[PDB]
Symmetry: C4
Subunit: 388 residues, 4 copies
């Protein structure tokens, strides 16, 4: 109908309830399930779907060998029904590429896929399932984007791109699209030193993204965007509760405008909901690998450099593999407020489980509840020995 | 369009005709069929679908090993087209959980799934395919529900929940939902001592549920609900024709307000249509196991403590496995009256057929006819030896 | 919209062109294709679909063993997209049964399935995908019907049923349904001695059915129905070109009101288009088995007891297996006349190819052309050796 | 709604971006993917789909043996969702045949399939998924058509057919269809000596087709059609940049009205966009086999007999297999101009890779961009050794 506007604030998050789980690897042991990674969830006004970057082969197929690799001509952004596994027969291809983002503006959906060699990549913006705009690499070093949904307000959908070094200063740009066309783009501003894979959500006409500083920060950079004025700023989450991975152990005081040192040249896509005392951070339990997953309520984490957890919820036990995580919300649900949601990618295979030659994942997603619900852990559930 | 109202009475049931049969296990021997249990049937104004609790694996898949277990993070309520098998590719996930119920109110469908650890479970109510309300465990002992469809009248859909001991007194509540929100809830009232897995239907603005007394009764408890006043009462079916399983042999006189003794701490979900002389009871033929299935016309079974069968129909021969059974009706069919229907779960595998390591089922469903139709038996049809 | 009326006459048939072919057995050698038999084609106002009686198992599945049998609790009438194979995932179940018919009346579709033991079978009439009417066996000896589409005119859809002996006089009835309800039924009238599996079509407010006299005729009985007056009559096709199978060799003069002797207690479902000089008969090439298939133009075959072919078209070579054949037309196609069509069931497996333990089929269908098109043969295409 | 009219001109082509890729062979190694060849892409006003000629078997199925053959009764024109593989379960059959074309006129789609023996073939024209017109062979020697989409203007859709010798003069006709009926047909006019498999596109009320001279030309014939006047003419592309295969090496000067000699009795379907200086030609890199694929900007290639490349883009490396290629455009996309697109068939198996007994393909498609995007190569991606 008309363009969606971010007119509501976030609901109070007292706990998280189970939303969707596909059990892809369990089912894929004996079904035609596509090998994937970098999944996410995104909603249309009438349906919410699972999304991911396919590797162009099934798990049981011989071409699954070598799927640990990130970029190839055989990947594609695919979407499929909520909680179903990504199968060959029920998956819909959005575009061809090894990095992506996608969001509905209220009228129709925009999907962006980046493909190419490392030094000659390009993004093609699709709108209403047709290619509309193309952007060539500007720093000639792996043009990349969010790997989770973008957000729109009155037709304008900002998207964060990064091109250049992953272990040094790079060139990040914020593009403001409307109906697939570029209205404007800015270079990154603020105090963030490195930006990659931003996880965004919107409320009260403002868009907040929690990204990944791959170069030096263990605390996460944040970009706040004003989609009306088409401007932005960046900083780091102040809290000592560090959320990247790998990372040092938590200190007693954090850093607001500088990366917290400890781990270099590595990280993981993550997210957070920054809403005053209604603030929740997600993170792997392990400080060394993508293992376990928990949510921690850290009041004023964004601005308080000494803030520590007041409540928490374990999503995946530390004995189980996790991976990327990002944010999404059903902006078309009924209600007085936006219910915060998130997904966790559960990676199986290489590099950790090297008895198999593939790398894939399943998905688990939760949304917030105003009740204080009991918790359960949500592992992938596949027994790797069954694949030998 | 508008909320459905239970304005009709039941059609005269002179016999039962075949409605749907999926042959899931036969087909699943060489197809990507999901392992399930606790199935049921539910109608929307334009289509009737099969429902069940998936185990998150196919029958032929290696993860089918251990599917005898009731609760895990890999189960989900799924629905699929009438008489098709529950396949990986044609199944739609309604919600994540190991216990459920679901019903259409005329405008849209409400689905409820309960998940969690035994002592920290929670129910999340979905309406129009979006989560709306959440309820945390109140007795911290396996919060559970119907495992068959609920029923609505002018927007109000009562649902019976039980939390607490399965072998002792528990806390049963009747929740009255409207558009996924809680209007009110009551503690169980009346003479029923234990309630579990209620099978409900509605007619002339009243909802009747035939449940399971797992603790001590071999006769079934009944809950009658008034969805307008939002009140209820309970008692037991008076008839000496006992319908739980396992159970003692039929006596000459039954009990109206007390459980009929004989078997303790066990049972099976079942149902009945209580309509004066137009009363039919369903039951396993075997008094010891979930074997065989028959329908018996027992006039005034609800109030006559000496009532015995006047007519009958064998659905499944005693040499064949049966299982859960419940009620449903197409409230949107044309006609002067509601045609009574029911389904029978046909369990294959463990614990009875222990040569295989899995437990699954197929479904058979019948609806009433005013004609006196000839009978046939409807077994699962799978030869277990084919799975070794 | 409104009920369809048979207001047109048949187009001139100068030859036949290929309409649909599913190659089910070829594809089913390595795909989840259901085992079937007794297929047919039927159109809705917006789509034409393939129909058949499933055996409730795939061809490669172990339960395919024994599918030569006609009646069991595992059969169901299924429909699927034109020219696709009947797969587990794309097939829609219309009803449960081992004998059927189905037709669209312009508003919605009626499907009838008969199930039961030989001496206690029953038909349940579905309309708009809901059961509406049920009919119990009247002669207690395999209640059976058309096995191809029925035809409607202004809401009235006659259907021919037969109950009783297949090798002696039986009780045939013509039921006139409207919206799934019985308006009236008649006992068979005219000179036909035995009727089974009628293949019907309609034109200019009259319905013609070419059936099978299993008892003694090698010439086919014909039933002409007036759907307005709801009356009918029957006779045999006069032509010496015999069309049942098995059958004696063609004589020089046929029989109009008596069965032509030669073969007893056997036959095959077939059809014909009887339209004065625009008359075409279909038949197996072999007089001994269901092998080969050809169409022969035999002017005035219905009334001329000496009529012989004036033109012909080979559909399946005598070295290839054929089987049942029946008529259907797209009554909703644009145009001044109804284009005659037909399908041929291509049976593979038992009893002829006994190296395999199953029996299944694929389908080929053609429609008429006013051009004189070149001919090609259309075999099943599967190599049985590939299934050992 | 209404018939589409070719009112726009072509967008400026500065480079090509990736549009769709199905990775059919990679996925088909362990999925129910149909064996195909002769693919193409065609758009409806609301969706663009992949099309191809099925061989009626899956790649892994035993019937894939011998699929190198061109014509059989088991082929069919099938369509499926963009970038998905052609699977047994998601493919839609358009018609039965071993040669085809198809296009949407704005209101509905016309599909044409030719089937038959070499000396008695026939084309049946389908419109709105119903057969409407039939044309019998005129030269009795493999009646054949485009093997890529046709184009319409105000309801009129010209289609080029060829019947007769492939190594000598043949009879080519241009049929002008409207709603599936023949308005008129012409014999080939102009200087082209042999025409086969025309690849067409339209702009500013004119339709241009780049075909294949199988008899003697290494330069391609071109047919320009005026769909309003229903007339046409033909010539050869003047440029010395030869685009058929096999072919001699490029000369310094080409031929405008004669075939350029060098290779006899062979070729490959190809295409070009002829638009003054905005002219791009596609061709295999290899002059000997269907290997590699590149696009070359050759200003005024159609009329300048000395024109040479000014820019280029490699699509498939010469070390990778290619095959047929053709044109298509989304005439229903928003915008001021028509964005040129094309597809490349990537043949795997026989005759080049003879370790397997089958022949199939996958598809890659690109559309033009006004940006100068970086290039990447797009191979099939399957490792043949995995099929042994
Ligand atoms: C029924 O359901 C309800 C709902 O779930 C259950 O109640 C919930 O129970 C939770 C578990 O106790 C409880 O969560 C905890 O809440 C406290 C705040 O009250 C929070 O501090 C906890 O978080 C710390 O502890 C966990 C381990 O338990 C750590 O993994 C987590 O990261 C937090 O500790 C780490 O970070 C802190 C901040 O920097 C450090 O101070 C601390 O030393 C520790 O640091 C180390 O570990 C880090 C991670 O490995 C590492 O990075 C760092 O470098 C150090 O090495 C936790 O969230 C819920 O609040 C509670 N919910 C409610 C409503 O009550 C109930 O029990 C269930 N019933 C039953 C029977 O189970
Ligand atoms: C063509 O089709 C028609 C339609 O189906 C056929 O006619 C039908 O035929 C049915 C079979 O005879 C007939 O059903 C029977 O009807 C009588 C009432 O008239 C009913 O009592 C029968 O039910 C008892 O018998 C069956 C065994 O046959 C038991 O399984 C059942 O539970 C009933 O008996 C048990 O419960 C009773 C009540 O307490 C006890 O009195 C009795 O002793 C017995 O108890 C033991 O068994 C129990 C179960 O194991 C156990 O719990 C208990 O503790 C004891 O150990 C049955 O329903 C239909 O009424 C009839 N329909 C019509 C319209 O006529 C026709 O025959 C078909 N034609 C052909 C050739 O087959
Ligand atoms: C390009 O395409 C066109 C279009 O197809 C081709 O032209 C067509 O060619 C057809 C083949 O010649 C031709 O069909 C024939 O037409 C004649 C009438 O003109 C018709 O009689 C033929 O039918 C008899 O013959 C076939 C065997 O060829 C039999 O199978 C068939 O049943 C008919 O014969 C049997 O029945 C008769 C009637 O009772 C008996 O008189 C006769 O003896 C025979 O009886 C025995 O066989 C029976 C079946 O086994 C058995 O029951 C009985 O008891 C006896 O044992 C046939 O239809 C088309 O008419 C013609 N079409 C046109 C428009 O011209 C053209 O050739 C193609 N080009 C090339 C190069 O192939
Ligand atoms: C990042 O991305 C951009 C965009 O892709 C990259 O820039 C592009 O780079 C391309 C590669 O250099 C460049 O394409 C070339 O452009 C020139 C015109 O400037 C064009 O002539 C080239 O085409 C010839 O060369 C290729 C081999 O490289 C041949 O395969 C091709 O057919 C052309 O040569 C043949 O035909 C000519 C005409 O007849 C003959 O003169 C010539 O001798 C040769 O003939 C032989 O080969 C034929 C084919 O086998 C055979 O039939 C014949 O008989 C003879 O045997 C080519 O298209 C793009 O123009 C350029 N794009 C832009 C916007 O700049 C950039 O490099 C990327 N960055 C990095 C680091 O890679
Ligand atoms: C464009 C690209 O390849 N992005 C990478 C990403 C990247 O390596 C880091 O952010 C550092 O630059 O890391 C990872 C990762 O698992 O850490 C997966 C992403 N894979 C894919 N998006 N395909
Ligand atoms: C919540 C739960 O696990 N319910 C159980 C149910 C339960 O054990 C009895 O009612 C006694 O409490 O029994 C059975 C059963 O087969 O008897 C299956 C149900 N399984 C599932 N709903 N998953
Ligand atoms: C109801 C029934 O079983 N009908 C039979 C039919 C029947 O045997 C003859 O007409 C003689 O009565 O023959 C055959 C047959 O192949 O000849 C298949 C049918 N199979 C099925 N409809 N399932
Ligand atoms: C009708 C027909 O069979 N056309 C052939 C085509 C033909 O051989 C040449 O154009 C010369 O006539 O060549 C080829 C080919 O790969 O070269 C495939 C086509 N295959 C199919 N369309 N099925
Ligand atoms: C969003 O706001 C604009 C005006 O700012 C309005 O045109 C549009 O309709 C609004 N969207 C919705 C969904 O109401
Ligand atoms: C996978 O590929 C590697 C590298 O090509 C090879 O060594 C290994 O054996 C392969 N594993 C399997 C299961 O094919
Ligand atoms: C149900 O009853 C209410 C009034 O009690 C009415 O608003 C509603 O439309 C009725 N439902 C239907 C389907 O007529
Ligand atoms: C199933 O699992 C059990 C317990 O882990 C094991 O003993 C058994 O061998 C397994 N059966 C199969 C067929 O894998
Ligand atoms: C069929 O005829 C009846 C009147 O005899 C009419 O009501 C109906 O609309 C007609 N059907 C169509 C499709 O026109
Ligand atoms: C099929 O079943 C028969 C009879 O039960 C048996 O003899 C035969 O061996 C079976 N064939 C196969 C392939 O299982
Ligand atoms: C195409 O042109 C004709 C008149 O020449 C017009 O009737 C038709 O509507 C036009 N098509 C569109 C899509 O506007
Ligand atoms: C394929 O068929 C040929 C010819 O019939 C035969 O020689 C060859 O062995 C077959 N190949 C396979 C893999 O079946
Ligand atoms: Ca980092
Ligand atoms: Ca009990
Ligand atoms: Ca006969
Ligand atoms: Ca050539």
């Amino acid at each position: 109908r008309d363009f969606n506007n971010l007119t509501k604030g976030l609901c109070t998050i007292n706990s998280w309830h189970i939303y969707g789980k596909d059990n892809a690897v369990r089912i894929g042991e004996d079904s035609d399930v596509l090998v994937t990674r970098e999944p996410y969830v995104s909603c249309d006004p009438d349906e919410c779907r699972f999304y991911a970057l396919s590797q162009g082969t099934t798990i049981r197929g011989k071409h699954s060998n070598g799927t640990i690799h990130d970029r190839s001509q055989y990947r594609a952004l695919i979407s499929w029904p909520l909680s179903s596994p990504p199968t060959v027969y029920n998956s819909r291809v959005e575009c061809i590429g090894w990095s992506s983002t996608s969001c509905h503006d209220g009228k129709t959906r925009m999907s962006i896929c980046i493909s190419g060699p490392n030094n000659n990549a390009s993004a093609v913006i699709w709108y209403n399932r047709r290619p509309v705009t193309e952007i060539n690499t500007w720093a000639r070093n792996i043009l990349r984007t969010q790997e989770s949904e973008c957000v729109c307000h009155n037709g304008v959908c900002p998207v964060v791109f990064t091109d250049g070094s992953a272990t040094g200063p790079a060139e990040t740009r914020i593009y403001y699209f409307k109906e697939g066309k570029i209205l404007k783009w800015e270079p990154l501003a603020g105090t963030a030193k490195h930006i990659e894979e931003c996880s965004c959500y919107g409320e009260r006409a403002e868009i907040t993204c929690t990204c990944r500083d791959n170069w030096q920060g263990s605390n996460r950079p944040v970009i706040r965007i004003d989609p009306v004025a088409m401007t932005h700023t960046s900083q780091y989450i102040c809290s000592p509760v560090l959320t990247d991975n790998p990372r040092p152990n938590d200190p007693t005081v954090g850093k607001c405008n500088d990366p917290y040192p400890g781990n270099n040249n590595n990280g993981v896509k993550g997210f957070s909901y920054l809403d005053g005392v209604n603030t929740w951070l997600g993170r792997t339990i392990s400080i060394a690998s993508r293992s376990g997953y928990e949510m921690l309520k850290v009041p004023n984490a964004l601005t308080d450099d000494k803030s520590k957890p007041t409540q928490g919820q374990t999503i995946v036990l530390n004995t189980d593999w996790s991976g990327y995580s990002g944010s999404f919300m059903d902006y078309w649900a009924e209600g007085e407020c936006y219910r915060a949601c998130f997904y966790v990618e559960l990676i199986r295979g290489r590099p950790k489980e090297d008895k198999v030659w593939w790398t894939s994942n399943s998905i688990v997603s939760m949304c917030s509840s105003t009740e204080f619900l009991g918790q359960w852990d949500w592992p992938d559930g596949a027994k790797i020995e069954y694949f030998l």
